[PDB]
Design a protein around this ligand. Structure first.
Ligand SMILES: CC(C)(C)c1onc(OCP(=O)(O)O)c1C[C@H](N)C(=O)O
Ligand SMILES: CC(C)(C)c1onc(OCP(=O)(O)O)c1C[C@H](N)C(=O)O
Lengths: 243, 243
């Protein structure tokens, strides 16, 4: 009965491996599908997974945020960052995942933090042109990140994350991006590693239209899953690589 | 006009240094006071800081949670963990700090993770008897923590965190406790260090009575502070030691 809007994004939402046509919600698998099953089991509801038409997360509105605003979806279950501008138009459950910006670089170097990159110019580094990561640096008033923005600002920016990862693999370049993706990539490419910890902090939350009768029910369920260790189990399940 | 309940806890809420009697809200200083000033400035409200009588956070209810439940306080601004049982009786803003259980141990050893402690018995380790940390281990079904509970369960538990810290300093003992305290202690005692990362995940939120007209206003303000980098600035301000 509940319409869930989401977006194809590895390993949150992916098509089950198969060479034949797949039907229904079961054609999808991933972290967010497992989370949805857990939520539906706790709250006791049926659901219909729909892919947001424009394939966008939500900016101003479009994407999943718009689907919720227009009430075409009851929930948005995806790695949707809880932000100031979004929280004003939709509601978010408490975070089912906490993350932040971090660094993707090749293993085997003495570089161990953002500071190490900030105090040199041999190694180039940047982020996806005009993304929230680039904006973070442009607006930061913190010493380390101001220096980094000055460097980035002075060809160090990339078209998208995929190109950024290739840049890291084919040149002496460090990429700044969402940490969850960095963990996913490093678990699959032993030549790459995360440099330092989280540069900023944010979380992913399940989205609902403002005033939804499921808002608090979902937060409670998430806290239950968090405390039972199920969110940790799910993260490990979909992120762990072959070592 | 707004009554804020809180609790003396270094460095969240402390008495300003002085040898003469201090009056009003200004007799207090700390991370939570700075957060309160920021919130009051954004939402535009006046406040009266009161110390919760029983000096408890909130368990079943007593402490700050009870003050909110009985509507004797409009807000609870303190390092109050957002939990399943508490969220059912009061409301929490989105987290202004994210943390978890971690390890406090002496520097200079090859121990680098919970796994390292779990696979040995020479070094004793434990937590505060009957606390949420001990309960975490007792209920965990994760290999590493089950092994640790078996060890702890088989004098490794302490009366309180202070005794635990002394145990770490005077004997070959590792203490499991809230990471925020570990960061505070290690910043002040160069002989101690945090072992590994976070074992579980949780956050601190501002508490309000269920159905408060400030609930969403505070979450929005927190996201604003988070995105502007003010929460990071405040954390650094009150946690940084003399190196
Ligand atoms: C979900 C995934 C981890 C793949 C992700 O990686 N980078 C992102 O955004 C960067 P920007 O804000 O620059 O578009 C997002 C999406 C983001 N969590 C959102 O809610 O829009
Ligand atoms: C605030 C501080 C960081 C000092 C803290 O350190 N250990 C704690 O609890 C351990 P237990 O749950 O075992 O009492 C708390 C208090 C906790 N955040 C709460 O909300 O009760």
């Amino acid at each position: 009965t509940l319409i869930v809007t989401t977006i194809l994004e590895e390993p949150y939402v992916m098509y089950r491996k198969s060479d034949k046509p797949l039907y229904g919600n079961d054609r999808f698998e991933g972290y967010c599908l497992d989370l949805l099953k857990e939520l539906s089991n706790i709250l006791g509801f049926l659901y219909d997974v729909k892919l947001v038409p424009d394939g966008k997360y939500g900016a101003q509105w479009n994407g999943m945020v718009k689907e919720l605003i227009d009430h075409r979806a009851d929930l948005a279950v995806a790695p949707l960052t809880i932000t100031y501008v979004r929280e004003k138009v939709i509601d978010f459950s408490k975070p089912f995942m906490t993350l932040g910006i971090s660094i993707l670089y090749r293993k085997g170097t003495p570089i161990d933090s953002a500071d190490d990159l900030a105090k040199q110019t041999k190694i180039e580094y940047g982020a996806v042109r005009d993304g929230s990561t680039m904006t973070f640096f442009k607006k930061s008033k913190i010493s380390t990140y101001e220096k980094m923005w000055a460097f980035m600002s002075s060809s160090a920016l990339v078209k998208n994350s995929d190109e950024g990862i290739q840049r890291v693999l084919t040149t002496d370049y460090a990429l700044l991006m969402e940490s969850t993706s960095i963990e996913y990539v490093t678990q699959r490419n032993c030549n790459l590693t995360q440099i330092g910890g989280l540069i900023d902090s944010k979380g992913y939350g399940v989205g609902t239209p403002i005033g939804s009768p499921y808002r608090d029910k979902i937060t409670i369920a998430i806290l239950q899953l968090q405390e039972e260790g199920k969110l940790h189990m799910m993260k490990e399940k979909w992120w762990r690589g072959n070592g």
